Amino acid sequence: VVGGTEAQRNSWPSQISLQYRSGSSWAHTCGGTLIRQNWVMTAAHCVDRELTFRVVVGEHNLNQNNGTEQYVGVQKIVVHPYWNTDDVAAGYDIALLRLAQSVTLNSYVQLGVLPRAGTILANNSPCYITGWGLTRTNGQLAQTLQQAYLPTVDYAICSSSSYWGSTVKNSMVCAGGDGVRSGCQGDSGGPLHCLVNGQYAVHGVTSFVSRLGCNVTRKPTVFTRVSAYISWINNVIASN
Ligand SMILES: [Ca+2]
């Protein structure tokens, strides 16, 4: 997250760190959202590589023991069947990870609330992106969870020529674009939490930013729109 502030330890208890095995240790690669005690929602492109992954819930500082982490293997990966690695702009950048064990819920580990199917936010709706991604374009991962206020940019504006044009689809949410705050590499797959009727819900799964850089004016961060996949998510969970 570029232009973020450190999240308070108990702020975003559905946020997970998706990590891959790297030699004798584990490297954060993406975010995700815990949606059942044994299911995580993340981006498809996070799991294109044939790596060994684990999920960390209750995580806050990647680099130090927080006393609150649970570490759990990924047992099954279900990518959206229409996802195509060569065409992130096509959409479908979503995947569900079934965990090897059910995690224990507490103040640091909670299920993310999902929007009702079809729900679209009015332009400039209040949202926060969270994650441990790069804190600057071509920078380094955050050690502690960051959050940035990123208000939505509605489809009409987002798909106009000076924003994302035809690259953005109505299956996506755009947020930010101020040239100061944005998602950045390592945030992918994580939540965009938006305030609706008094309650934060996870409306976005972080998907991409501009090749020109993370915080680019008129290139808001782009998220898979969770509300376009509610049936799909329910169907996968019901059949696995
Ligand atoms: Ca830690």
Contact yes or no for 35/236 (Cβ under 8 A): no
Report how far residue 201's alpha carbon sits from residue 192's, in angstroms, rounded to the nearest whole number: 8
Give the Cβ contact number of residue 86 at 10 Å. 5
Q: Would you state the torsion angle of the CA atoms of residues 115, 120, 126, 127, taken in this order, to the nearest 10 degrees?
A: 50
Identity of the residue numbered 198: G
Distance 140 CA to ligand 1 centre (A): 17
Beta bridge partners of 78: 96
Q: Can you say which residues are annotated as belonging to the binding site?
A: 59, 61, 64, 69
Look at residues 234, 151, 140 and name the one whose alpha carbon lies nearest to residue 193.
151
Residue in 17, 28, 60, 93 annotated catalytic: 93
Amino acid at 194: C
To which CATH superfamily is domain 13-111+228-240 assigned? Trypsin-like serine proteases (2.40.10.10)
Contact 148, 4 (CB under 8 A): yes
CA distance linking residue 127 with residue 10, whole number of Å = 17
Dihedral sign of CA atoms 185, 191, 195, 199 in order: negative
User: Strand, coil or helix: what is 55?
Assistant: strand
Ligand 1 centroid, distance to 64 Cα (angstroms): 5
Number of residues that make up the chain: 240
Q: How far apart are CA 197 and CA 194, in angstroms?
A: 10
Task: Please name the fold of domain 1-12+112-227.
Answer: Thrombin, subunit H (2.40.10)
- Which residue in 14, 17, 188, 210 is the catalytic one? 188
The H or E element containing residue 221 is: strand 221-225
Residue 164 burial by Cβ neighbours in a 10 Å radius (0-12, 13-18, 19+): buried
Domain ranges of the chain: 1-12+112-227, 13-111+228-240
CA 33 to ligand 1 center in whole angstroms: 17
Distance CA 43, CA 137 (A): 20
| Catalytic status, residue 45 | yes
| Euclidean distance between CA atoms 58 and 198, whole angstroms | 24
Contact 222, 153 (CB under 8 A): no
Of 45, 80, 193, 203, which is the active-site residue? 45
In this chain, the answer to whether the domains covering 1-12+112-227 and 13-111+228-240 adopt an identical fold is yes
Give residue 219 CA to ligand 1 midpoint distance, Å: 32
Q: For residues 176 and 151, what is the distance between their CA atoms, to the nearest angstrom?
A: 6
Distance CA 183, CA 155 (A): 18
| Contact indicator for 51, 28 with CB cutoff of 8 Å | no
**Could you tell me the resolution of this structure in angstroms?**
1.8
CA dihedral 136, 190, 210, 179 (to 10 degrees): -50
Distance of alpha carbon 218 from alpha carbon 214, whole angstroms: 11
Q: How far is the CA of 62 from the centre of ligand 1 (A)?
A: 5
Angle at 34 between CA 117 and CA 235, to 5 degrees: 45
SS3 106: strand
DSSP per residue over 177-238, as a string? Answer: -SSS-B--TT-TT-EEEEEETTEEEEEEEEEE-BTTBSSBTTB-EEEEEGGGSHHHHHHHHH
Q: List, as residue ranges, the binding site for Ca(2+).
A: 59, 61, 64, 69
